[PDB]
Design a protein around this ligand. Structure first.
Ligand SMILES: [Ca+2]
Length: 223
């Protein structure tokens, strides 16, 4: 997260860290046994870390649970990043409490102008590299589809939306991928891609979760 603020320990209780020996992507807990993330975060050997603030220090509220199954969306396209969503099943159910909690799926899509919360442990600089150890937060609005398509000609599908600031300075970034965009208490986006980070006229692009609710619910029901 570039240009954000320190969330505070366990104030984003649905945020997860995907660990393969190190943090490499975010995700969101959607019930006691399932996480949603970005398909471009796919790899084998994932451990899901819940209840994290400082990902390099054991602070006492963590739960570490290995993945038993990962399901990349059937139509994921790694070249365009269309359908950049995957589901991860945990080997055992998480213990839900005030600091580890699921985020509701949306019943309706969010409109441009809605303010959302984006969070992650990704890079905090637009030029250079500095990775934080505590969770960072950003409040950002959903941008109009017209402005999104104008920023990224020929690259925005109906399964994507832009959020952030056309003036630059505030954005998600590398290492935030897979993490949540929460608007009015519902999961509306997944950190997916962008051109650099926090650059003028290049806002972040997010997977549009409301398009996938039926697939998520059907998949969870049968796996
Ligand atoms: Ca920790």
């Amino acid at each position: 997260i570039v240009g954000g603020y320190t969330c505070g320990a366990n104030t984003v209780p649905y945020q997860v860290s995907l660990n393969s020996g190190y943090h490499f992507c975010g995700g969101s807990l959607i019930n006691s046994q399932w996480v949603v993330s970005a398909a471009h975060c796919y790899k084998s050997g994932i451990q899901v870390r819940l209840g994290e603030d400082n990902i390099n220090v054991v602070e006492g509220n963590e739960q570490f649970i290995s993945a038993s199954k990962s399901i990349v969306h059937p139509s994921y396209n790694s070249n365009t990043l269309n359908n950049d969503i995957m589901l991860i099943k945990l080997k055992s159910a998480a213990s839900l409490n005030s600091r580890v909690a699921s985020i509701s799926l949306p019943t309706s899509c969010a409109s441009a102008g809605t303010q959302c919360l984006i969070s992650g442990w990704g890079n905090t600089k637009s030029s250079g590299t500095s990775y934080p150890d505590v969770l960072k937060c950003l409040k950002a609005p959903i941008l109009s589809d017209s402005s999104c398509k104008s920023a990224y000609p020929g690259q925005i599908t109906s399964n994507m939306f832009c959020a952030g600031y056309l003036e630059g300075g505030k954005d998600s970034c590398q290492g935030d991928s897979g993490g949540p965009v929460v608007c009015s208490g519902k999961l509306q986006g997944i950190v997916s891609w962008g051109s650099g980070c926090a650059q003028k006229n290049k806002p972040g692009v997010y997977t549009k979760v409301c398009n996938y609710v039926s697939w998520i619910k059907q998949t969870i029901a049968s796996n």
